[PDB]
Amino acid sequence: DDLYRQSLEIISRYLREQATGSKDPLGEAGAAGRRALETLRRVGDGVQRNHETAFQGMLRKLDIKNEDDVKSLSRVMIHVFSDGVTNWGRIVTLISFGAFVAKHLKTINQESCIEPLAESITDVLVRTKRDWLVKQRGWDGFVEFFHVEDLE
Ligand SMILES: Cc1ccccc1-c1cccc2c(CCCOc3cccc4c3CCCC4)c(C(=O)O)[nH]c12
Ligand SMILES: Cc1ccccc1-c1cccc2c(CCCOc3cccc4c3CCCC4)c(C(=O)O)[nH]c12
């Protein structure tokens, strides 16, 4: 599965470099993956700053203490992503909260749960939104959407 293997890479690398504080060198320059991670860094870091309150509140509410609580995250994700509208905004918000949660997993000494968490995000993202992802040219459409430079 090309669109899954790709999503899992962008989602895995973002959550990892966010939790660590330093960038790992993803794919190849100019490709969908490279541009998608650079975009996700730009728009997603903003989402975590702008929505820090709501993110602190959802994290407390979710009360993720261990590995079990990480695995059980697929349930609330399925609930939320099977509802409302589909747009890249929601997709970037979903990945930004996963980077926020991944930072917490580090502070609570559950670093190992991060890649499993990333896996769970890709699984929910594809099972609830793949027809829309295909129709949108996947990570190429994502990149194109947040490309605001050639409008004039
Ligand atoms: C504030 C909001 C505005 C717009 C877009 C998104 C969000 C939003 C963000 C994050 C989570 C939620 C939730 C779920 C609340 C926690 O629910 C659970 C917790 C643990 C297990 C389970 C669940 C529910 C399913 C069963 C298993 C709802 C919601 O219910 O409307 N909205 C959310
Ligand atoms: C911004 C915002 C404003 C006001 C009040 C609340 C919020 C809010 C808080 C937290 C997440 C979201 C999301 C992402 C979709 C739900 O994602 C999750 C739900 C449960 C667990 C996990 C996720 C993502 C991966 C980590 C594990 C949306 C959104 O799509 O509009 N809004 C959220």
Numbering used by the authors: 172 to 195, 198 to 325
Manuscript text:
One avenue began with analysis of a series of indole-2-carboxylic acids which have been reported by others. Investigating one such literature compound, 1, we were able to obtain a co-crystal structure in complex with Mcl-1. Surprisingly, we observed two inhibitors bound to the BH3-binding domain of Mcl-1. The first high-affinity binding (cyan molecule in Fig. 1a) overlays well with reported crystal structures, with the 2-carboxylic acid forming an ionic interaction with Arg263 of Mcl-1 (dotted line) and the naphthyl group occupying an induced-fit pocket. To our knowledge, this 2:1 stoichiometry has not been observed previously with this series of compounds and results in a conformational change in Mcl-1 protein residues (e.g., Met231 side chain and larger movement in the Leu246 to Asp256 helix) to enlarge the binding pocket and accommodate the second binding molecule. Since this larger pocket may be more druggable, we hypothesized that a new hybrid molecule able to take advantage of both binding events would have vastly improved potency compared to 1 or 2 (Mcl-1 TR-FRET IC50s = 1.1 and 0.29 µM, respectively). Given the short distance between these molecules, we reasoned that a two-atom linker would be appropriate to link the two monomers. Application of structure-based drug design to a new binding mode of a known inhibitor scaffold bound to Mcl-1 led to identification of an induced-fit pocket in Mcl-1.
